[PDB]
Amino acid sequence: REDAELLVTVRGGRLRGIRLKTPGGPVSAFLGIPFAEPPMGPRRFLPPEPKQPWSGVVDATTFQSVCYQYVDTLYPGFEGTEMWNPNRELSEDCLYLNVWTPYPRPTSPTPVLVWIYGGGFYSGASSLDVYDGRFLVQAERTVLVSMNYRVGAFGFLALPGSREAPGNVGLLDQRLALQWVQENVAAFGGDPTSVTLFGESAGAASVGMHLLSPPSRGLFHRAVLQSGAPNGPWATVGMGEARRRATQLAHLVGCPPTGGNDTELVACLRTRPAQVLVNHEWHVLPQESVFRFSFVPVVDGDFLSDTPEALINAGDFHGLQVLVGVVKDEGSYFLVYGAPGFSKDNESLISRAEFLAGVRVGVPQVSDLAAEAVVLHYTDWLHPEDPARLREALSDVVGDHNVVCPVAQLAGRLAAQGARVYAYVFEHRASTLSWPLWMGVPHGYEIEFIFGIPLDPSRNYTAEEKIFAQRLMRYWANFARTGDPNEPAPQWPPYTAGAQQYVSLDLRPLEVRRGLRAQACAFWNRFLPKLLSA
Amino acid sequence: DAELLVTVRGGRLRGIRLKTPGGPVSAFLGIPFAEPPMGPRRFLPPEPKQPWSGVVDATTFQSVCYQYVDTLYPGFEGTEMWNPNRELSEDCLYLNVWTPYPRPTSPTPVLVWIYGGGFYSGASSLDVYDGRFLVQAERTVLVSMNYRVGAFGFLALPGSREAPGNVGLLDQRLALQWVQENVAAFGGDPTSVTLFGESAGAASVGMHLLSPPSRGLFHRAVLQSGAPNGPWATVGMGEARRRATQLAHLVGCPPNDTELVACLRTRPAQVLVNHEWHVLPQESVFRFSFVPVVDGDFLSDTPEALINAGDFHGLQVLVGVVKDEGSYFLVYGAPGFSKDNESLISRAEFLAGVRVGVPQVSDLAAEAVVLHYTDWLHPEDPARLREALSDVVGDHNVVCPVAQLAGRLAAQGARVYAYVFEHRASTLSWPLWMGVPHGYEIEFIFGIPLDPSRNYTAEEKIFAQRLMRYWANFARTGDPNEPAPQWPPYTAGAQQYVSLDLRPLEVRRGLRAQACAFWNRFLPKLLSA
Ligand SMILES: *[C@@H]1O[C@H](CO[C@@H]2O[C@@H](C)[C@@H](O)[C@@H](O)[C@@H]2O)[C@@H](O[C@@H]2O[C@H](CO)[C@@H](O)[C@H](O)[C@H]2NC(C)=O)[C@H](O)[C@H]1NC(C)=O
Ligand SMILES: *[C@@H]1O[C@H](CO[C@@H]2O[C@@H](C)[C@@H](O)[C@@H](O)[C@@H]2O)[C@@H](O[C@@H]2O[C@H](CO)[C@@H](O)[C@H](O)[C@H]2NC(C)=O)[C@H](O)[C@H]1NC(C)=O
Ligand SMILES: *[C@@H]1O[C@H](CO[C@@H]2O[C@@H](C)[C@@H](O)[C@@H](O)[C@@H]2O)[C@@H](O[C@@H]2O[C@H](CO)[C@@H](O)[C@H](O)[C@H]2NC(C)=O)[C@H](O)[C@H]1NC(C)=O
Ligand SMILES: *[C@@H]1O[C@H](CO)[C@@H](O)[C@H](O)[C@H]1NC(C)=O
Ligand SMILES: *[P@](C)(=O)/N=C(\C)N(CC)CC
Ligand SMILES: *[P@](C)(=O)/N=C(\C)N(CC)CC
């Protein structure tokens, strides 16, 4: 008849799951649990409404739809890009979450890891193969939760002050899922008092925004931020620029028959097919760029009462443990998406003129003086025109500006204001990587190791890569359990604003180093803001 | 002795025979080349010396031009060696000629030395500028002149005929004209004149390079630890007028240019000297009150602009710096510094020192300096902070202006040779933390180690002979090289220079290229926007 392990009652009703095989043994999975009412029709752009209770048994036996989003077509059929594309049908009916728990169900409350996917706030899905939670749960005996949240215009189009499209509803989707975890994770054996958020890129930025938003902060205990931070130059937008982008998108799809009554404008937007909005999404950006996304969280005083930078500097973070880090080559992946002279299919040995033009694309919407300051710091004036050095320098510009230095600033300020911080740099290039060698260890390619994907027998990772993945899963689960990645062996010291110690994650044992590109990040974090103001 | 009797255009001279370890030389010291700029002639351009009857006694140095006397460390060798060693006088426009003995009967290349001293001090009579060893060892003619310094040489009420400014530079030019007309009577070749100078003397050399009336008076140029494009070597017309006006007020004179200068001319020379430092707009190091003014006459534009717009084909220049250009100046005002301790400053003192070492810039500019010269992995290490502030002062005032001059001249047709002088003299009296300080290559260029009464090592005597050979080789041919390894020319791309030390030449790339990109390429854009 029924497997009692695969049957769970939550607040809304009864669920039926599936028993998953893993290389290490069985795991219980409840995939596609509805946590909100479908944000369709009149509910497009609105905050999520909690899922109404149901009679009978909901089959949570497969991943639900991917939230409607742009699909990348830069390199069709190429594994390096297709691995990030939707692997389920697109739909606005997409507010579902997933729970993995050990088989049999834990008998005592078990620490919970909650994953928030990245994707520049315009893409992503909890169903991607690289976010498969079965290996972590089996290997480390935690409960793992992941949720879908609205992206692009559907999640982050904002007419600030309006009731019809207030913005940040994609973040409210995440918060509702976190509230669902608090109310229901115990039914799966999870400990609601030991919830660790973790996420990568825009997912890491989301984690940070939940840290800085008091209504979210009560819903979790620890945080992990991989290759992303809320204080990046891409992760938030001001109210005026958000209104300008939303108004231009409406104009590009014929609404209204520009601006005017917000209620009328949104009502017209709600009549457009979802794909019509997606087709014009990228056109509302003020200039050609890399690492910039049209509809992102808006700083409007509500979800974020101030800029993440201000909230970080003004925050008391005693009692908080965070784990943060970057990959070795954060900037390289983004260059083939607009920087002149770049391609995955050649060595991208750019000229000096291409480097100077690339700086304006990688640092958009700054004064000519600011761009000259960037050129000053990233030119080797003994080799100003060397194509190989210019390629790596532009990668450093984009990676430092968008990822490394925002992460370093967050790590240093949190540590100085009471938090226990652990920092890493991920330095192993996967044997299965399909991107060219010049990209190094690109953005996003630590995730598969954190999730234990090398343990999948159908994949062809080396044996030592499987050992490496098991080590990383152990660090992450140790942190979730205790707030300390170290095993209760070379030790991982906390990051502090003074000593600035971090560890290198690679096939070799831990190596302790100092400074997350300290000289470069002093420019981005300490001087360049002063320049932009004067 | 007929070798010591010379007739120049103005009349007859009697010189003196001098001893060196390598043999005798002929010296003619204290030759008047201008009418004494006294009384009504104060602040005015020099007038050529009128002819005289009889024989001028040219056997001893003449008076030092009126100037401030350093009293930071009284009796200390390291400072006293720069102080006046003859009586001060406004009657000071004299020059000196050294020739081989017996006097050359064939035209000999001429070296003309212009002393430094921040345009406020200096004298051709200082022991460290003794030309006897260069003349004997390398068989050149050596000429050095006194020129007016301080307010007497560079007080300017721009537009006025009573105090036009730059008359100290005109003193140098008049001496250069005197060389053209008279050096052949000593055996010198007026068609082979090489200017060399250090610090403000090097800045002076560069200004003669950029002023067409001076360009026809010499052939090659050597610029040691100085350049005309520094932040200290020139002043704008408005600031010069403000400084001249403030000086008058400080000495009890009214604010009309004719009445102001007339009152200034009634004051004793020492009175002007006593108030010279107070007309500066703020407390600082490496800033001087009365310097050349850019008013469109001697300099038709800023030295920076003239260098960028110039065609320098047919020019050969020798330029260079010492290893630690900034250290000497730190004890003259940076908080926490002294020659008598290790000067291990704090972060707060470093930040205060930046405003002293980079005066009269915006707060944003100062923050940019702090950014580039902070090691953000060791932001508060006192030894690093000491070295960093020395780099700030040295790069801003000497190294990067020299690097900019070298690169632009080379890219625009000149043949440039660049050095870094890295030997600390065994006789140096300054503390070890100062390294190889500003000004302490001069004694080696002039062959002072050859003086047996001094305490230089045998190695240092050979080193000095090497340096004299490079300098004289350059004066003779425009190329310091002997027929080593070779000293390659400096170019804007390769940026090659040599290290001058006891060891053989080593070729290196970049005169603090990363730091000087900040000072030369970025910081001007920041200050203007
Ligand atoms: C902006 O317009 C809304 C909606 O107005 C309605 O839709 C318009 C296209 C048009 O058909 C109007 O006649 C409709 O009333 C206004 O909200 C409406 O306000 C009126 C007055 O209270 C009310 O009767 C409607 O029910 C309201 N509709 C909704 C959906 O809230 C709103 O007041 C207007 N604001 C302005 C013009 O500043
Ligand atoms: C490296 O590749 C870029 C990208 O060009 C594309 O990919 C190449 C592999 C090749 O298939 C091209 O035809 C593709 O268009 C080259 O930059 C492009 O150059 C072409 C013409 O030179 C120009 O029309 C495109 O706009 C350029 N694209 C970008 C993004 O700059 C680049 O020249 C290649 N480098 C080489 C060949 O050294
Ligand atoms: C290093 O010396 C400086 C200079 O102080 C002078 O020289 C010393 C050798 C000694 O003789 C002092 O008494 C002299 O005043 C020191 O900087 C001074 O510090 C005092 C306080 O102790 C302060 O009142 C002065 O203003 C400072 N002067 C300057 C120019 O900053 C410095 O503290 C010494 N460093 C040490 C001892 O580590
Ligand atoms: C691993 O290699 C095998 C053998 O060629 C192949 O069948 C399989 O598709 C590979 N796995 C992946 C994930 O590509
Ligand atoms: P962040 C900017 O969300 N990084 C995303 C775009 N990556 C996509 C390859 C990793 C999810
Ligand atoms: P420049 C600034 O003229 N060099 C001076 C300071 N030195 C004197 C101590 C060298 C003569």
> Which single residue is written with the structure tokens 């006194």?
B146
CA angle A140, A146, A148 (to 5 degrees): 165
Query: What are the beta bridge partners of residue B145?
Result: B95
Whose CA is closest to B34, among B216, B176, B186, B150?
B176
Query: What are the beta bridge partners of residue A339?
Result: none
Q: By the 8 A CB rule, do A268 and A257 touch?
A: yes
Q: Please count the other Cβ atoms lying within 10 Å of the Cβ belonging to residue B30.
A: 22
- The pairing of strands A143-147 and A96-102 is antiparallel
- Please give the distance, rounded to the nearest whole angstrom, from the Cα atom of residue B206 to the centre of ligand 4: 72
Q: Which helix (H) or strand (E) holds B57?
A: strand B55-57
Q: At a CB cut-off of 8 Å and minimum separation 6, what does B399 contact?
A: B321, B325, B511, B512, B515, B516
Q: For residues B130 and B444, what is the distance between their CA atoms, to the nearest angstrom?
A: 11
DSSP string, B397-442: IIIHHHHHHHHHHHHTT-EEEEEEE-PPPTT--S-GGG-SBTTTTH
- Which ligand 3 atom sits closest to the C-alpha of B337? 3
Category of B296 on φ-ψ map: left (φ > 0), alpha (ψ -120 to 50) or beta: left
Q: Is B363 exposed, middle or buried (0-12, 13-18, 19+ CB in 10 A)?
A: exposed
CA B164 to chain CA mean position, Å: 22
Q: For residues A274 and A260, what is the distance between their CA atoms, to the nearest angstrom?
A: 22
Which domains are seen in chain B, by residue range? 1-529 (3.40.50.1820)
Q: By the 8 A CB rule, do B44 and B165 touch?
A: no
Query: What are the beta bridge partners of residue A520?
Result: none
Nearest Cβ partner of B513 from A367, A382, A500? A382
Q: Which long-range contacts (CB under 8 A, 24 or more apart) does A170-174 make?
A: A170/A121, A170/A297, A171/A206, A171/A209, A171/A210, A171/A213, A171/A297, A171/A303, A172/A47, A172/A48, A172/A303, A173/A36, A173/A48, A173/A95, A173/A147, A173/A148, A173/A149, A174/A116, A174/A147, A174/A149, A174/A206, A174/A210
Query: What are the beta bridge partners of residue B7?
Result: B12
CA angle B359, B363, B365 (to 5 degrees): 75
With H, G, I as helix, E, B as strand and everything else as coil, classify residue B286.
coil
Q: For residues A371 and A373, what is the distance between their CA atoms, to the nearest angstrom?
A: 5
| Ligand 1 pocket residue status of A427, Cβ below 6 Å | no
Q: What is the resolution of this structure in A?
A: 2.1
- Please give the distance, rounded to the nearest whole angstrom, from the Cα atom of residue A329 to the centre of ligand 5: 13
Structure tokens that stand for A289 in this block = 């760029």
For residue A381, list chain B residues with Cβ-Cβ distance below 8 A. 510, 513-514, 516-517
Q: At a CB cut-off of 8 Å and minimum separation 6, what does B285 contact?
A: B329, B330, B332, B333, B334, B356, B357, B393
Protein residue closest via CA to atom 8 of ligand 5 = A119
Whose CA is closest to B173, among B136, B129, B210?
B210
Q: By the 8 A CB rule, do B209 and B236 touch?
A: no
Contact at CB, A527 and B371, closer than 8 angstroms: yes
Residue type at position A439: M
Whose CA is closest to A142, among A88, A203, A99?
A99
> Which single residue is written with the structure tokens 């020019």?
B315
Task: Tell me if residue B208 is catalytic.
Answer: no
Q: By the 8 A CB rule, do B202 and B401 touch?
A: no
Contact at CB, B376 and A527, closer than 8 angstroms: no
- Method for this entry: X-ray
> Which single residue is written with the structure tokens 């001028």?
B56
- Calculate the CA dihedral of residues A460, A464, A468, A474 and round it to 10 degrees: 100
Structure tokens that stand for B505 in this block = 């030449």
DSSP string, A326-343: EESBSSHHHHTTT-TT--
Query: What are the beta bridge partners of residue B88?
Result: B64
**Considering every ligand atom, which ligand is closest to the CA of B149?**
6
Q: Where are the alpha helices (DSSP H) in B23-149?
A: 77-80, 132-138
Q: For residues A322 and A312, what is the distance between their CA atoms, to the nearest angstrom?
A: 13
Task: Tell me if residue A428 is catalytic.
Answer: no
Beta strands in A328-475 (DSSP E): 420-426
Q: Which residues of A291-311 are buried (b: 16+ CB within 10 A; e: fewer)?
A: bbbbbbbbbbeebbeeebbeb
Q: By the 8 A CB rule, do A312 and A414 touch?
A: yes
Q: For residues B209 and B193, what is the distance between their CA atoms, to the nearest angstrom?
A: 13
Q: For residues A443 and A84, what is the distance between their CA atoms, to the nearest angstrom?
A: 12
Q: Is B491 exposed, middle or buried (0-12, 13-18, 19+ CB in 10 A)?
A: middle
Q: Is B428 exposed, middle or buried (0-12, 13-18, 19+ CB in 10 A)?
A: middle
- The pairing of strands A25-34 and B235-236 is unpaired
| Ligand 4 pocket residue status of A460, Cβ below 6 Å | yes
Which of B361, B376, B509 is the best residue to mutate to test the A interface, defined by the most A CB atoms within 10 Å of its own CB?
A: B376
Q: For residues A503 and A495, what is the distance between their CA atoms, to the nearest angstrom?
A: 9
State the number of CA atoms in the 13 A half-sphere of A10 facing the CB: 28
Q: At a CB cut-off of 8 Å and minimum separation 6, what does B383 contact?
A: B344
Q: By the 8 A CB rule, do A265 and A256 touch?
A: yes
Q: At a CB cut-off of 8 Å and minimum separation 6, what does B462 contact?
A: none
Q: Please count the other Cβ atoms lying within 10 Å of the Cβ belonging to residue A20.
A: 18
A435 is in an annotated binding site: yes
Nearest Cβ partner of B525 from A372, A381, A514? A372
Instruction: Point out residues after which chain B has a gap (C–N over 2.5 Å).
Output: 255, 483
> Which single residue is written with the structure tokens 């965070």?
A322
State the number of CA atoms in the 13 A half-sphere of A475 facing the CB: 30
With H, G, I as helix, E, B as strand and everything else as coil, classify residue B96.
strand
- Calculate the CA dihedral of residues A353, A356, A358, A359 and round it to 10 degrees: 180
Protein residue closest via CA to atom 21 of ligand 2 = A341
Measure Cα distances from A252 to A120, A249, A269, A435, B297 in Å. Answer: 22, 5, 11, 35, 62
Contact at CB, B368 and A527, closer than 8 angstroms: yes
Query: How many residues are given for chain A?
Result: 534
Measure Cα distances from A257 to A2, A284, B173, B463 in Å. Answer: 56, 19, 80, 87
Provide the total of helices (H) and of strands (E) in chain B, helices listed first: 19, 18
Q: For residues B141 and B190, what is the distance between their CA atoms, to the nearest angstrom?
A: 10
In chain A the first and final C-alpha atoms are separated, in Å, by 72
Q: Which helix (H) or strand (E) holds B238?
A: helix B237-250
Using CB distances shorter than 6 Å, the residues near ligand 3 are: B 335-336, 338, 340-341, 343-344
| Ligand 4 pocket residue status of A193, Cβ below 6 Å | no
Structure tokens that stand for B199 in this block = 């610090």
